[PDB]
Amino acid sequence: PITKEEKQKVIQEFARFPGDTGSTEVQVALLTLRINRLSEHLKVHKKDHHSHRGLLMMVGQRRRLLRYLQREDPERYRALIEKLGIRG
Amino acid sequence: AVKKFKPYTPSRRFMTVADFSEITKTEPEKSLVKPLKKTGGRNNQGRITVRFRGGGHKRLYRIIDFKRWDKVGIPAKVAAIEYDPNRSARIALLHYVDGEKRYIIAPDGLQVGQQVVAGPDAPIQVGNALPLRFIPVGTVVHAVELEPKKGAKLARAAGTSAQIQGREGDYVILRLPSGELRKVHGECYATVGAVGNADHKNIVLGKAGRSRWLGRRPHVRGAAMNPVDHPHGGGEGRAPRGRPPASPWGWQTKGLKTRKRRKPSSRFIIARR
RNA sequence: AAUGCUAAU
RNA sequence: CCGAGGGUAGGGCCCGUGACUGGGGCGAAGUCGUAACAAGGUAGCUGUACCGGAAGGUGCGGCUGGAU
RNA sequence: UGGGAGAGGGUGGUGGAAUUCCCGGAGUAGCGGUGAAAUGCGCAGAUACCGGGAGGAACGCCGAUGGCGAAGGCAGCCACCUGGUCCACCCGUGACGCUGAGGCGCGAAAGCGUGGGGAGCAAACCGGAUUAGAUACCCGGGUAGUCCACGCCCUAAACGAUGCGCGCUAGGUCUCUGGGUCUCCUGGGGGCCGAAGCUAACGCGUUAAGCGCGCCGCCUGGGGAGUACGGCCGCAAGGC
RNA sequence: AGCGCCGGCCAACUCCGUGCCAGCAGCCGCGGUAAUACGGAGGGCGCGAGCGUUACCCGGAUUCACUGGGCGUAAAGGGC
RNA sequence: GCUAGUUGGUGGGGUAAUGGCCCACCAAGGCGACGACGGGUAGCCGGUCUGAGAGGAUGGCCGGCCACAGGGGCACUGAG
RNA sequence: CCUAAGGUAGCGAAAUUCCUUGUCGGGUAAGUUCCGACCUGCACGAAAAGCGUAACGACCGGAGCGCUGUCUCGGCGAGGG
RNA sequence: GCAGUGAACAGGCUCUGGCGACUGUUUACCAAAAACACAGCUCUCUGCGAACUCGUAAGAGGAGGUAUAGGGAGCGACGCU
RNA sequence: GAGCUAGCCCUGGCCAGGGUGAAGCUGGGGUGAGACCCAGUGGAGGCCCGAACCGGUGGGGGAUGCAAACCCCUCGGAUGA
Ligand SMILES: [K+]
Ligand SMILES: [K+]
Ligand SMILES: [K+]
Ligand SMILES: [K+]
Ligand SMILES: [K+]
Ligand SMILES: [Mg+2]
Ligand SMILES: [Mg+2]
Ligand SMILES: [Mg+2]
Ligand SMILES: [Mg+2]
Ligand SMILES: [Mg+2]
Ligand SMILES: [Mg+2]
Ligand SMILES: [Mg+2]
Ligand SMILES: [Mg+2]
Ligand SMILES: [Mg+2]
Ligand SMILES: [Mg+2]
Ligand SMILES: [Mg+2]
Ligand SMILES: [Mg+2]
Ligand SMILES: [Mg+2]
Ligand SMILES: [Mg+2]
Ligand SMILES: [Mg+2]
Ligand SMILES: [Mg+2]
Ligand SMILES: [Mg+2]
Ligand SMILES: [Mg+2]
Ligand SMILES: [Mg+2]
Ligand SMILES: [Mg+2]
Ligand SMILES: [Mg+2]
Ligand SMILES: [Mg+2]
Ligand SMILES: [Mg+2]
Ligand SMILES: [Mg+2]
Ligand SMILES: [Mg+2]
Ligand SMILES: [Mg+2]
Ligand SMILES: [Mg+2]
Ligand SMILES: [Mg+2]
Ligand SMILES: [Mg+2]
Ligand SMILES: [Mg+2]
Ligand SMILES: [Mg+2]
Ligand SMILES: [Mg+2]
Ligand SMILES: [Mg+2]
Ligand SMILES: [Mg+2]
Ligand SMILES: [Mg+2]
Ligand SMILES: [Mg+2]
Ligand SMILES: [Mg+2]
Ligand SMILES: [Mg+2]
Ligand SMILES: [Mg+2]
Ligand SMILES: [Mg+2]
Ligand SMILES: [Mg+2]
Ligand SMILES: [Mg+2]
Ligand SMILES: [Mg+2]
Ligand SMILES: [Mg+2]
Ligand SMILES: [Mg+2]
Ligand SMILES: [Mg+2]
Ligand SMILES: [Mg+2]
Ligand SMILES: [Mg+2]
Ligand SMILES: [Mg+2]
Ligand SMILES: [Mg+2]
Ligand SMILES: [Mg+2]
Ligand SMILES: [Mg+2]
Ligand SMILES: [Mg+2]
Ligand SMILES: [Mg+2]
Ligand SMILES: [Mg+2]
Ligand SMILES: [Mg+2]
Ligand SMILES: [Mg+2]
Ligand SMILES: [Mg+2]
Ligand SMILES: [Mg+2]
Ligand SMILES: [Mg+2]
Ligand SMILES: [Mg+2]
Ligand SMILES: [Mg+2]
Ligand SMILES: [Mg+2]
Ligand SMILES: [Mg+2]
Ligand SMILES: [Mg+2]
Ligand SMILES: [Mg+2]
Ligand SMILES: [Mg+2]
Ligand SMILES: [Mg+2]
Ligand SMILES: [Mg+2]
Ligand SMILES: [Mg+2]
Ligand SMILES: [Mg+2]
Ligand SMILES: [Mg+2]
Ligand SMILES: [Mg+2]
Ligand SMILES: [Mg+2]
Ligand SMILES: [Mg+2]
Ligand SMILES: [Mg+2]
Ligand SMILES: [Mg+2]
Ligand SMILES: [Mg+2]
Ligand SMILES: [Mg+2]
Ligand SMILES: [Mg+2]
Ligand SMILES: [Mg+2]
Ligand SMILES: [Mg+2]
Ligand SMILES: [Mg+2]
Ligand SMILES: [Mg+2]
Ligand SMILES: [Mg+2]
Ligand SMILES: [Mg+2]
Ligand SMILES: [Mg+2]
Ligand SMILES: [Mg+2]
Ligand SMILES: [Mg+2]
Ligand SMILES: [Mg+2]
Ligand SMILES: [Mg+2]
Ligand SMILES: [Mg+2]
Ligand SMILES: [Mg+2]
Ligand SMILES: [Mg+2]
Ligand SMILES: [Mg+2]
Ligand SMILES: [Mg+2]
Ligand SMILES: [Mg+2]
Ligand SMILES: [Mg+2]
Ligand SMILES: [Mg+2]
Ligand SMILES: [Mg+2]
Ligand SMILES: [Mg+2]
Ligand SMILES: [Mg+2]
Ligand SMILES: [Mg+2]
Ligand SMILES: [Mg+2]
Ligand SMILES: [Mg+2]
Ligand SMILES: [Mg+2]
Ligand SMILES: [Mg+2]
Ligand SMILES: [Mg+2]
Ligand SMILES: [Mg+2]
Ligand SMILES: [Mg+2]
Ligand SMILES: [Mg+2]
Ligand SMILES: [Mg+2]
Ligand SMILES: [Mg+2]
Ligand SMILES: [Mg+2]
Ligand SMILES: [Mg+2]
Ligand SMILES: [Mg+2]
Ligand SMILES: [Mg+2]
Ligand SMILES: [Mg+2]
Ligand SMILES: [Mg+2]
Ligand SMILES: [Mg+2]
Ligand SMILES: [Mg+2]
Ligand SMILES: [Mg+2]
Ligand SMILES: [Mg+2]
Ligand SMILES: [Mg+2]
Ligand SMILES: [Mg+2]
Ligand SMILES: [Mg+2]
Ligand SMILES: [Mg+2]
Ligand SMILES: [Mg+2]
Ligand SMILES: [Mg+2]
Ligand SMILES: [Mg+2]
Ligand SMILES: [Mg+2]
Ligand SMILES: [Mg+2]
Ligand SMILES: [Mg+2]
Ligand SMILES: [Mg+2]
Ligand SMILES: [Mg+2]
Ligand SMILES: [Mg+2]
Ligand SMILES: [Mg+2]
Ligand SMILES: [Mg+2]
Ligand SMILES: [Mg+2]
Ligand SMILES: [Mg+2]
Ligand SMILES: [Mg+2]
Ligand SMILES: [Mg+2]
Ligand SMILES: [Mg+2]
Ligand SMILES: [Mg+2]
Ligand SMILES: [Mg+2]
Ligand SMILES: [Mg+2]
Ligand SMILES: [Mg+2]
Ligand SMILES: [Mg+2]
Ligand SMILES: [Mg+2]
Ligand SMILES: [Mg+2]
Ligand SMILES: [Mg+2]
Ligand SMILES: [Mg+2]
Ligand SMILES: [Mg+2]
Ligand SMILES: [Mg+2]
Ligand SMILES: [Mg+2]
Ligand SMILES: [Mg+2]
Ligand SMILES: [Mg+2]
Ligand SMILES: [Mg+2]
Ligand SMILES: [Mg+2]
Ligand SMILES: [Mg+2]
Ligand SMILES: [Mg+2]
Ligand SMILES: [Mg+2]
Ligand SMILES: [Mg+2]
Ligand SMILES: [Mg+2]
Ligand SMILES: [Mg+2]
Ligand SMILES: [Mg+2]
Ligand SMILES: [Mg+2]
Ligand SMILES: [Mg+2]
Ligand SMILES: [Mg+2]
Ligand SMILES: [Mg+2]
Ligand SMILES: [Mg+2]
Ligand SMILES: [Mg+2]
Ligand SMILES: [Mg+2]
Ligand SMILES: [Mg+2]
Ligand SMILES: [Mg+2]
Ligand SMILES: [Mg+2]
Ligand SMILES: [Mg+2]
Ligand SMILES: [Mg+2]
Ligand SMILES: [Mg+2]
Ligand SMILES: [Mg+2]
Ligand SMILES: [Mg+2]
Ligand SMILES: [Mg+2]
Ligand SMILES: [Mg+2]
Ligand SMILES: [Mg+2]
Ligand SMILES: [Mg+2]
Ligand SMILES: [Mg+2]
Ligand SMILES: [Mg+2]
Ligand SMILES: [Mg+2]
Ligand SMILES: [Mg+2]
Ligand SMILES: [Mg+2]
Ligand SMILES: [Mg+2]
Ligand SMILES: [Mg+2]
Ligand SMILES: [Mg+2]
Ligand SMILES: [Mg+2]
Ligand SMILES: [Mg+2]
Ligand SMILES: [Mg+2]
Ligand SMILES: [Mg+2]
Ligand SMILES: [Mg+2]
Ligand SMILES: [Mg+2]
Ligand SMILES: [Mg+2]
Ligand SMILES: [Mg+2]
Ligand SMILES: [Mg+2]
Ligand SMILES: [Mg+2]
Ligand SMILES: [Mg+2]
Ligand SMILES: [Mg+2]
Ligand SMILES: [Mg+2]
Ligand SMILES: [Mg+2]
Ligand SMILES: [Mg+2]
Ligand SMILES: [Mg+2]
Ligand SMILES: [Mg+2]
Ligand SMILES: [Mg+2]
Ligand SMILES: [Mg+2]
Ligand SMILES: [Mg+2]
Ligand SMILES: [Mg+2]
Ligand SMILES: [Mg+2]
Ligand SMILES: [Mg+2]
Ligand SMILES: [Mg+2]
Ligand SMILES: [Mg+2]
Ligand SMILES: [Mg+2]
Ligand SMILES: [Mg+2]
Ligand SMILES: [Mg+2]
Ligand SMILES: [Mg+2]
Ligand SMILES: [Mg+2]
Ligand SMILES: [Mg+2]
Ligand SMILES: [Mg+2]
Ligand SMILES: [Mg+2]
Ligand SMILES: [Mg+2]
Ligand SMILES: [Mg+2]
Ligand SMILES: [Mg+2]
Ligand SMILES: [Mg+2]
Ligand SMILES: [Mg+2]
Ligand SMILES: [Mg+2]
Ligand SMILES: [Mg+2]
Ligand SMILES: [Mg+2]
Ligand SMILES: [Mg+2]
Ligand SMILES: [Mg+2]
Ligand SMILES: [Mg+2]
Ligand SMILES: [Mg+2]
Ligand SMILES: [Mg+2]
Ligand SMILES: [Mg+2]
Ligand SMILES: [Mg+2]
Ligand SMILES: [Mg+2]
Ligand SMILES: [Mg+2]
Ligand SMILES: [Mg+2]
Ligand SMILES: [Mg+2]
Ligand SMILES: [Mg+2]
Ligand SMILES: [Mg+2]
Ligand SMILES: [Mg+2]
Ligand SMILES: [Mg+2]
Ligand SMILES: [Mg+2]
Ligand SMILES: [Mg+2]
Ligand SMILES: [Mg+2]
Ligand SMILES: [Mg+2]
Ligand SMILES: [Mg+2]
Ligand SMILES: [Mg+2]
Ligand SMILES: [Mg+2]
Ligand SMILES: [Mg+2]
Ligand SMILES: [Mg+2]
Ligand SMILES: [Mg+2]
Ligand SMILES: [Mg+2]
Ligand SMILES: [Mg+2]
Ligand SMILES: [Mg+2]
Ligand SMILES: [Mg+2]
Ligand SMILES: [Mg+2]
Ligand SMILES: [Mg+2]
Ligand SMILES: [Mg+2]
Ligand SMILES: [Mg+2]
Ligand SMILES: [Mg+2]
Ligand SMILES: [Mg+2]
Ligand SMILES: [Mg+2]
Ligand SMILES: [Mg+2]
Ligand SMILES: [Mg+2]
Ligand SMILES: [Mg+2]
Ligand SMILES: [Mg+2]
Ligand SMILES: [Mg+2]
Ligand SMILES: [Mg+2]
Ligand SMILES: [Mg+2]
Ligand SMILES: [Mg+2]
Ligand SMILES: [Mg+2]
Ligand SMILES: [Mg+2]
Ligand SMILES: [Mg+2]
Ligand SMILES: [Mg+2]
Ligand SMILES: [Mg+2]
Ligand SMILES: [Mg+2]
Ligand SMILES: [Mg+2]
Ligand SMILES: [Mg+2]
Ligand SMILES: [Mg+2]
Ligand SMILES: [Mg+2]
Ligand SMILES: [Mg+2]
Ligand SMILES: [Mg+2]
Ligand SMILES: [Mg+2]
Ligand SMILES: [Mg+2]
Ligand SMILES: [Mg+2]
Ligand SMILES: [Mg+2]
Ligand SMILES: [Mg+2]
Ligand SMILES: [Mg+2]
Ligand SMILES: [Mg+2]
Ligand SMILES: [Mg+2]
Ligand SMILES: [Mg+2]
Ligand SMILES: [Mg+2]
Ligand SMILES: [Mg+2]
Ligand SMILES: [Mg+2]
Ligand SMILES: [Mg+2]
Ligand SMILES: [Mg+2]
Ligand SMILES: [Mg+2]
Ligand SMILES: [Mg+2]
Ligand SMILES: [Mg+2]
Ligand SMILES: [Mg+2]
Ligand SMILES: [Mg+2]
Ligand SMILES: [Mg+2]
Ligand SMILES: [Mg+2]
Ligand SMILES: [Mg+2]
Ligand SMILES: [Mg+2]
Ligand SMILES: [Mg+2]
Ligand SMILES: [Mg+2]
Ligand SMILES: [Mg+2]
Ligand SMILES: [Mg+2]
Ligand SMILES: [Mg+2]
Ligand SMILES: [Mg+2]
Ligand SMILES: [Mg+2]
Question: Quaternary structure (chain A)?
Answer without folding.
Answer: Part of the 30S ribosomal subunit. Forms a bridge to the 50S subunit in the 70S ribosome, contacting the 23S rRNA.
